[PDB]
Amino acid sequence: MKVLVLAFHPNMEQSVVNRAFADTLKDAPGITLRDLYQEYPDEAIDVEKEQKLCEEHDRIVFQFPLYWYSSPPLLKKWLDHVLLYGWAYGTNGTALRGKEFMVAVSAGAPEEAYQAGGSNHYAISELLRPFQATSNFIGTTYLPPYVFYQAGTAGKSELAEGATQYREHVLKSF
C-alpha cells in the first residue's frame, strides 16, 4: 500500500527511461516518489529524514539506471550513511524488519546479454546480489526486481509499454 520510491539518477531532466517510469507514479495514491540527486545536489544526506521516511512506508523501491553493473554512487552513499547500527541492524536495529525491498533498474544492453553464454555473462539476479544481501541483513523481504533492457534504444512505444509495466510491478502484491 504505502510505497516509497527512491530514484537515483544524476540528472532526472536529461533522463529518458527513468523519467518516463517516474512520470507514471505522480498521482498513484500510496506512492511517495523522490528524486534524491535533486534533493541532495551536494550529496549531503539528511540521515534522519531518510530513516523517518523508510519507517513510514511499507515497501521501499530503489530506482536507478544500471551503471557499471551497479547503481549511481549516491545510492551507495545512501546505504552507507542511512543504514546504521541500532536502526537498520544491530541490537535495537529493527526498524526495517518486515518491510518489502525491491529494485527497479534500467540497463542499456539487451536481455540476451545478461546470462551465461551471453555477452555480459551473468544474469541480472547475479549482478544485483549486493542489494539482495543488503536486504537480507536489514530484515526486509526481497521482491523480484523490475528490469528494463535496451534502455534508450528500445523505441517510443516499447518504452511506453515498459513504463506501464514498471507501474504495475511496483504496485503489485507478491
Ligand X SMILES: Cc1cc2nc3c(=O)[nH]c(=O)nc-3n(C[C@H](O)[C@H](O)[C@H](O)COP(=O)(O)O)c2cc1C
- Residue positions in the annotated binding site? 9, 15-18, 66, 68-69, 106, 108-109, 114
Distances from the Cα of 83 to the Cα of 48, 114, 116, 159, angstroms: 10, 30, 33, 33
66 near ligand X (CB under 6 A): yes
Q: Considering all CA atoms of the chain, what is the largest pairwise distance in Å, rounded to the nearest integer? A: 50
Given candidates 40, 51, 53, 108, which one binds ligand X under the rule CB under 6 A?
A: 108
122 near ligand X (CB under 6 A): no
Stretch of 26-34, 41-49, 65-73, 77-85 lying at the interface with ligand X (CB under 6 A): 65-73
- Residue with Cβ nearer ligand X (90 or 152): 152
Is the CB of residue 72 less than 8 Å from the CB of residue 10? yes
DSSP codes of every residue in 103-116: EEEE-SS-GGGSST
75 near ligand X (CB under 6 A): no
E strands along the chain, which residues?
3-7, 31-35, 59-65, 100-106, 141-142, 146-148
Annotated binding-site ranges for FMN:
9, 15-18, 66, 68-69, 106, 108-109, 114
Stretch of 36-44, 80-88, 104-112, 157-165 lying at the interface with ligand X (CB under 6 A): 104-112
- Residue with Cβ nearer ligand X (18 or 24): 18
CB 43 → ligand X: shortest distance, Å? 17
